[PDB]
Ligand binder design. Structure first.
Ligand SMILES: Nc1ncnc2c1ncn2[C@@H]1O[C@H](COP(=O)(O)O)[C@@H](O)[C@H]1O
Lengths: 122, 122
């Protein structure tokens, strides 16, 4: 009985652009669940985080706007969305997903979710 | 009685050391006020921060455990203490020298303010 919003990212060096992404995400519902990329997932995207996955998760968990934070699953965003059951998934201004592709992918799993692109912080 | 705790720092790049300092400081009272160093002060103490003072302050304000955050005074700590009027001032575990120095200031003036060193972070 609440609108659950899922946001994602690496969150290596926290900065106000993150805060903008997370607050705009929280506004859309009641609960904000943040999925923090695994170090392996981050490397496979050509980033080696300065802070390890456990440290990045713990810091994100300390933010007022974050209700729950969990680690992602290496290789398997399908499973995260199945386990979180968001009503809404938010995409950062620069995140590399096509809203259409993501939607059809999620619909093939028999899940209905609203996908929203968040603005760049200025 | 609502105990006011004052913590201080630059908080340039947030990390779990900062979180342990802030979180343990909050545990000691009811309101945590964080005093964030101005860019001139940090520079003058030989630590150039990469994030500007307004950014650092704004990010610190987003932490669950922080009730209020303010910019410090350009080179005059006792002026901050006189304005914030904390019940407790929190220092890092390593800072016994700063502790003794602050204690002499307190004692000469005869104000009621308790200094507490926070436990060493792991
Ligand atoms: N400057 C910014 N403006 C808006 N959103 C941002 C900014 N910086 C990071 N984000 C978002 O925060 C999430 C995590 O970014 P990252 O830690 O770079 O993976 C992604 O959705 C980003 O688009």
């Amino acid at each position: 009985g609440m609108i659950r919003v899922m946001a994602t990212g690496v969150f290596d060096i926290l900065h106000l652009g993150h805060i903008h992404y997370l607050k705009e995400s929280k506004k859309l519902g009641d609960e904000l669940v943040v999925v923090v990329a695994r170090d392996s997932t981050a490397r496979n995207n050509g980033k080696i985080p300065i802070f390890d996955e456990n440290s990045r998760l713990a810091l994100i968990s300390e933010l007022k706007v974050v209700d729950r934070a969990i680690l992602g699953h290496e290789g398997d965003m399908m499973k995260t969305v199945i386990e979180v059951k968001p009503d809404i998934i938010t995409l950062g201004y620069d995140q590399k997903f096509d809203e259409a592709e993501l939607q059809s992918k999620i619909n093939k799993l028999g899940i209905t979710v609203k996908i929203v692109r968040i603005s760049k912080y200025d």
